[PDB]
Structure formats: C-alpha cells, structure tokens
C-alpha cells in the first residue's frame, strides 16, 4: 500500500493580520532585524533566528511569514514578529492566521524517465528540458504541483495542509514506479 | 537562418567569489547593521544589495552558527572604520595571495 | 478585430512563411494566438509579450507536429531573451491548458546535422574531413539513441547531446585521420556553434561506450580508453541494445549500474534532512527573547548618523 516514504516539509508560507496600520519607517529604524527600501519594495523585510524565518510586514498591518519547516513553527514565528511590532509601540493583534502554501520534498531512490512520463500522463505533464531539468506535474486531486527529476527527487508545492503533500506523493509514487 | 539554434539563458549577472577575509568583513556588517542588506551593500562599494542578500542566504545554510553569533554579538556601527578596514583587507590579503 | 491582434496574426503568418513550415501549421498557430487573445491578461499585455506570444503559438504548433523548432531559434528570430520567452511560454501553456509534446530528437538530429558543412571540401574543410551526409546522420541517430537509453538525455538540453553524438559519428567513420581533431575544432570547421555542455555529453558518451566495450571479449583484451574506443564505435553500435543490457545491472525483463550522471556525482552529503521538531506554536514568548531584535537608543543614533 504506502511507499514507506514521508515527504519532508521544506517551506511554509503563512499570512496574518496585525489589525492596525503601521509606520514602516519607524519599524525599519527601531528594529535590528528589519530591512526597508520603499523605492525598491513597499514592505519591511524582517528576520528572526528561531524559528529561522523571514517576514514581509506591510503598512496595511498585513504580514507574510516564509521559511518555517512546520505549520506550528510558522505560527510561533508569526507570533514573534507580531510581538516585535507590539514592542515598537503599535497596537498589533494576531488575526486571521492562515497557512497559504507548503513545499515538501522527497526521494523515491530510483531514476525517472521524464520523456516517458510526459507521454503516458501528457495532460498533467509539462517537460521542457530547454528551460528546466524537471517535469512539472500538475495533479488535480489534490491540486498540487510536483517537480519530478531524473534522480528520483521530487518537489511538491501548492498545499494548504500537510495531508495534501502526503496525498499527492502517495498518488505519484505508483505512477513513477511503473 | 537556423531552426535548431541552441537555447541558453543570457541574463546571467556575475559576482566575484568572497575572499575568506571579505567574508570576515561581511559578518562584521551583520554585527554593526544587523540584517538590513541595502545598508550593508553601501558598506561594500563593489557588492550590490542582491550580492549581500545571496551571501547571507548561503552563509545561513552552510554556516548557520556564524550568522546567529554575528547578530547576538551586537557592535557599535562605525561606517568610516568599516570603509578603511575593508579597503585595507581587500588590498593586504590580495597582496599576500 | 483589435489592431494589435491583426498585427499579431500577420506576424504569426510571416513567421510560418520565414520558417518554410507546411501550409496547415499557419492556421493552427493563428488559432492559438486568437484563443490567447480571448484572455484579458494577454489582451492588456505589453507589445513585447505579444511579440513573444507569436513565437509561442508557432513553437507549440511545431511541437505538436514533431517539427524540430528550438526555443533558441525562435528567440533569435524574435530578438527575445530565453527567460522572457520562458515566462510567456509557461504562462500560455497553463492558460490555454495545452499538452505540449517534447522536442522530437530524431527530427532534430536530421535538421541540425544537415547544417554541419562537412559534405563538400573547402579551404576550411579538407578532403579527409568530408563525410557522407546519410552515413553521418544514421550513426549520429544511433549514438543519440544510445545516450537516451543510458540516461544522458533526460533533463539535459537535447542539442549538446546531438553535437557530441555527431562529432563521435564523424570521428568513428574515419578514425585514423579524425582522432586528432577535438570537439572544438570540429564545430569550427562544420561552422556550428559549440554548446558548452557538449564537451560533458561527449565524455559521458565515451564512458558509456567504454563500459560496453568491456562486454565484448575481443575488445576487453585491448584495454581501451576514451581515445582508442573511437575506432570500435561502429562495432559497439552494431550490438548497442545487447551490450547496454549486459553492461548494466539495473534493468527489468518487462559493479556498473545504469543510472543518470546526477545520481553518481557522489557528493559527501546527500539531502541534509530538516531536523524532526514537533514544537507547538502556543509556547510563551519572553520579553528578553523579543528585546534582542530591538535597537538601543545609542544603536538608533549610530544608524541615523550613518544615513
């Protein structure tokens, strides 16, 4: 039944509303871990060491948290950025936290004939070796995008919950095997 | 002309490899500035903002312990001292190499 | 009816005529451009994207008929960078929900190798370097099939594989007089640009042919190397299917292991797994934990002075 292979989560993208307008000039100047160039990009780029993540803080009070390895780590990191903003004098709240994207990876430990997969599963496969070495597999159930490499290494992305990464990998494994 | 011309990407923009002491100096910038890469990119005259950010993201992977130490080890930010020290480090080490 | 659509459809037809494509191709490519234009995101796109789109529609048409047109050929004709072409091509394939067949290797071998100027003598092509076009194409195709069977094609740009195979076919057809000529010298006289990965494909193909040579007792005894194996390529290709199967442990009936070169690179570290952590996102956040991310009044003054 199961492959015995568990995809490892490599990246989580989450969003949260701090529920108040923010002065990014103030945040940039008074935080240590902030980067702000409004002429280049309209948001503050903030980093914390644990969980090792990056946040994009917008003047609207909305925030994007990237880089966490678990949904719990993404929430703890998002709460820490919210606490940094609060200490900077803003009445920040922690509203509508939501995981938006999850990236997983694994190795099936056998080589994959991408040129063969693009023939049997043409309607889901996009294999362009003139642009990229991996086959782009757009699974419909669950709606996950997989990057399949000749080495057997697989990248899974577009998931909202952990189970969608696992479901897509369990679906692709027999297709890749035989 | 031909209909079989080789397809290669051309928008590649070159960055010089980081000298062991140019790296030591990069970690000095995380101690003085923190993680504001544009300001650090101003401390390095021949390094762009992206070059600082990619260096940070490489060091983050391979030598995580050094990124964490340079940030926890806060240091007075002296722009002038960094400029003179960087000009000398990039000169002296290049000479000894 | 749109002025930019009429201009685009005219450009689609002009590109097909310049490429000397069969008459049925123009209509299919025009239909894709019209379909593309029904999306508001394409209608409001920059004129540069509408220029690349002309190429995407013609390339998709060629791919569906196994006409071996490369993205590099289209980029040259459209004065487009490959990454500029990549974003429009990937977008329109997703947008129109199209199944795009792969580049047809057998057809690319024929078109690309016919461009090699080695079929007539000239001041730059001496008599001993002149080869029969059909003999050359047939051996190059066999070497491309070998590279494909031994995992040298998958995920790589197909053209450098054909360059390495065409060179090896050419050398093996007259080994005594052509073994001194390098890949770079060969592409220069044939008047074909040398793709950088072609040298790597060559070395991989020679390594594969050497493993095969170990499966023939009368070749195994000659202790062949990447130079001495060239005169036996004809012999090796005569029994390529059989020799590949025998030389490699990995293969089904329905020390050497047939694997892609990126699996045998053998790095000292393979996928350093993220550490297992099951920490809840509900744990207390102390004031000291947060305060380390804040600048002191002195740090604010020292930053302000530096700005």
Residue numbers in the entry:
A (entry chain B): 157 to 334
B (entry chain C): 286 to 382
C (entry chain A): 65 to 318, 354 to 406
The authors write:
RNA polymerase III (Pol III) is the eukaryotic multisubunit DNA-dependent enzyme dedicated to the transcription of short untranslated RNAs involved in essential cellular processes, such as the entire pool of transfer RNAs, the 5S ribosomal RNA, and the spliceosomal U6 small nuclear RNA (snRNA). Transcription initiation requires the action of the TFIIIB complex, which is both required and sufficient to recruit Pol III to the promoter and to faithfully initiate transcription in yeast. In the context of such TFIIIB complexes, TBP recognizes specifically the TATA box inducing a sharp bend of the DNA, whereas the TFIIB-related factors Brf1 and Brf2, similarly to their Pol II paralog TFIIB, recognize TATA-flanking regions and interact directly with Pol III, thus effectively bridging the polymerase to its target promoters.
Bdp1SANT could be crystallized by vapor diffusion in complex with Brf2, TBP, and a DNA fragment of 25 base pairs (bp) of the human U6 promoter (referred to as TFIIIB–DNA complex hereafter), and the X-ray structure was solved at 2.7 Å by molecular replacement. The SANT domain of Bdp1 interacts with both TBP and DNA, while a structured linker emerging at the N terminus of the SANT domain interacts with the minor groove of the DNA. The N-terminal region flanking the Bdp1 SANT domain, which we named the “Bdp1 linker” (residues 286–302), adopts an extended conformation, spanning the entire length of the minor groove of the DNA and inserting in between the two Brf2 cyclin repeats. Bdp1 F294 buries into a hydrophobic cavity formed by the sugar moiety of the DNA, TBP L187, and Brf2 L146. The recognition helix (α3, residues 334–347) of Bdp1SANT contacts both sides of the major groove of the DNA, using conserved polar residues to interact with the phosphate backbone of the template and non-template DNA strands. In particular, the invariably conserved Bdp1 residue R334 forms a salt bridge with TBP residue E191, and contacts the DNA phosphate backbone of the template strand.
